[PDB]
Design an enzyme around this catalytic site. Sequence first.
Site, mmCIF file in Angstrom:
data_model
loop_
_atom_site.group_PDB
_atom_site.id
_atom_site.type_symbol
_atom_site.label_atom_id
_atom_site.label_comp_id
_atom_site.label_asym_id
_atom_site.label_seq_id
_atom_site.Cartn_x
_atom_site.Cartn_y
_atom_site.Cartn_z
ATOM 1 C CE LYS A 110 33.676 45.243 43.349
ATOM 2 N NZ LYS A 110 34.494 45.523 44.717
HETATM 3 C C1 LIG Z 1 46.850 34.012 38.525
HETATM 4 C C2 LIG Z 1 45.486 34.813 38.812
HETATM 5 C C3 LIG Z 1 43.945 33.792 39.334
HETATM 6 C C4 LIG Z 1 44.878 36.364 38.994
HETATM 7 C C5 LIG Z 1 44.036 37.133 38.713
HETATM 8 C C6 LIG Z 1 44.420 38.146 39.389
HETATM 9 C C7 LIG Z 1 43.046 39.338 40.392
HETATM 10 C C8 LIG Z 1 43.085 39.002 41.635
HETATM 11 C C9 LIG Z 1 41.940 39.144 38.818
HETATM 12 C C10 LIG Z 1 40.802 39.622 39.209
HETATM 13 C C11 LIG Z 1 40.642 41.037 40.102
HETATM 14 C C12 LIG Z 1 39.004 41.603 41.052
HETATM 15 C C13 LIG Z 1 38.127 41.047 39.810
HETATM 16 C C14 LIG Z 1 39.067 42.276 41.621
HETATM 17 C C15 LIG Z 1 38.018 42.958 42.896
HETATM 18 O O1 LIG Z 1 38.463 44.056 42.569
HETATM 19 P P1 LIG Z 1 37.929 44.425 42.143
HETATM 20 O O2 LIG Z 1 38.152 44.346 41.157
HETATM 21 O O3 LIG Z 1 36.832 46.065 41.956
HETATM 22 O O4 LIG Z 1 39.383 45.965 41.114
HETATM 23 P P2 LIG Z 1 40.793 46.005 40.949
HETATM 24 O O5 LIG Z 1 40.193 44.904 39.358
HETATM 25 O O6 LIG Z 1 41.452 46.855 40.667
HETATM 26 O O7 LIG Z 1 41.114 44.953 41.999
#
Ligand SMILES: CC(C)=CCC/C(C)=C/CC/C(C)=C/COP(=O)(O)OP(=O)(O)O
Lengths: 401, 315
Positions: free
Chosen positions: B110
């Site tokens: 991740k």
């Molecule tokens: C301003 C700014 C920096 C905004 C971005 C917000 C943000 C937290 C974006 C990405 C989320 C991410 C890739 C999460 C990892 O868990 P996951 O990918 O497995 O699961 P999830 O997509 O449901 O969190």
Amino acid sequence: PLYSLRPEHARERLQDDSVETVTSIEQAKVEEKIQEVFSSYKFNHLVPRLVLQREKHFHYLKRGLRQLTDAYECLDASRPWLCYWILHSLELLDEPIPQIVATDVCQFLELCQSPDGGFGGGPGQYPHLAPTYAAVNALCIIGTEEAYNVINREKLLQYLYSLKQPDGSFLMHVGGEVDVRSAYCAASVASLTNIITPDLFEGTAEWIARCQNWEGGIGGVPGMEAHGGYTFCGLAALVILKKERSLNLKSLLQWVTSRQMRFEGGFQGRCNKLVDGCYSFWQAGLLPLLHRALHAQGDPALSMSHWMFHQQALQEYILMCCQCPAGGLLDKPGKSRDFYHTCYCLSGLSIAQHFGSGAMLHDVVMGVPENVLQPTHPVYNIGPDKVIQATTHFLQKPVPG
Amino acid sequence: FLSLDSPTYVLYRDRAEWADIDPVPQNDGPSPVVQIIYSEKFRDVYDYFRAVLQRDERSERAFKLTRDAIELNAANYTVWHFRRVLLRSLQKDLQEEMNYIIAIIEEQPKNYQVWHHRRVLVEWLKDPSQELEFIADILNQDAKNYHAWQHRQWVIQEFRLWDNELQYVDQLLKEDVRNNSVWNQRHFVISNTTGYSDRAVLEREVQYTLEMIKLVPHNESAWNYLKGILQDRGLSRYPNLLNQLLDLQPSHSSPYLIAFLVDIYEDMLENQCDNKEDILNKALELCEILAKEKDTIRKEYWRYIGRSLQSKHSR
Ligand SMILES: CC(C)=CCC/C(C)=C/CC/C(C)=C/COP(=O)(O)OP(=O)(O)O
Ligand SMILES: [Zn+2]
């Protein structure tokens, strides 16, 4: 009664069509666990139970703002982020910042400001749009002349320029990559400190627009699955650049609405993905923006009292499933608490709690009246009075050249 | 070399090879805020990274120092950058490093920083041979890993490796037809290959999606893809679609199904269709069936829609 408690709500459970898949499985699990939480409040009540544990929250924040444990070692390069999360969290909790911490915050961020513009994850770290967005945002929350004067505007613009790309995108930091979030960081920073030159955002809007995908949402880079985070960064960014019309707003709105979990009442970040407290802001933050946009386009069918999402349903999830006894807020029941989520769940709740369009104002506060958080700007995610205070202060100064 | 957990691990402050260098302590000011109580090992490594970074020391020792630093906080983009700065400066065996990042990514699938580095190493080597396979392994851990998906896409575009991904998409969809990340990939491939304007392609897809809905009537992904590949084209333009959809109504309904009809009717009204009133009512009906029953969560949405259909197709 409460939406999540009404008899018929048992109908909003997942129907896996008898075809189990890793997705249906994990979703049901969360549902069962949340249902458990739901039963608890349906069962007992003689005094109001939907209460925002302000007290506990304030301790958590007040402490973190000063010291952290080594669990936070993983965020050593995200320290301005912590100033922000916390300070914003307190602001929403309408907790005032003591003049001393205010000055110390200023001084730490000063130490995190690169000589070549921007801010790094900590003192002596390469500048990165992320902590930069952060630090600026945090400095404006303090809202002092001292706070504002920390930002070397001249250098800030040059830094933005270094990350600026031909196609309209920006790197997150030198030698890094791009995605919509960086664009949002720049847009944000520049507008508040008033350093937007005629060519700084040349082509940027088009780029961001190229990220909105088939689902109607926005991914980080064109082609990518549409996702709350990036989606917010995208549209907000556009709102700042007055280019929201570049996006197919119809597909975007339908999509966002489709992110709220029927059962849980909260928001997922992607379709067929679990619910998450942070999305309470990310996802629900979209609605006030789309409202602005559509409203500007004279949309007559708009509501004059409600956001296009189940405001009531979100507050309940937050309040019922996202609060930690020791303080702070979180992802979903079986997760650890952290400042990150503490900033977003709160932001999200305030969003769902206050509506405003033109002169129309109409709150929606689930639980005790005392649950009202300070409202937040759907764009910068800081106090509206703060935004107004800062831009006004920087518009006194001429845009660097 | 010496793992940070080794019983025999030794501090950089007590390593002879590092004796000449005066570590640089981080400065947080007279009254720190958001100050982490680092462990001794953490502070030590970073006290020396600061010294290496300060004098831009392009040594082998420093390259190794970055490894520990990364272990201590793989999110440190600053550390990630300088290491690459070193890999260049020391003409490092890039495949060896590829082996390093492979191991690391499987560990923190991740972390953004980790994939970025893989990306750079990949354009440097100009060799994508291990990629698709590797991403497949990571995707076995989490088939929705955003990062793993972004990388695959870049690799596929950069290196024009479009040949077998559509089959991969089918593989993953059988594994979990509810995997949205895969439906997006499917769209990605097609819009990047045959294009959807190839009517023979649009028909194969719409048909595919319809069979998929038939199996999992409540899977939103399928529905979203269908809407996606036809929305800009004008839903009402496909009369056969509407007839097959209404056929699902009995043993295959859902709020998505009803939602889709709403759009279809919405498109008809825009296209100035015949029996304008009959349709408007068919639409407003469903909007309320959703608003009050089948999609209450979005009641606010559905009322606005209905409100809109009226606002420009009544009286
Ligand atoms: C301003 C700014 C920096 C905004 C971005 C917000 C943000 C937290 C974006 C990405 C989320 C991410 C890739 C999460 C990892 O868990 P996951 O990918 O497995 O699961 P999830 O997509 O449901 O969190
Ligand atoms: Zn989260």
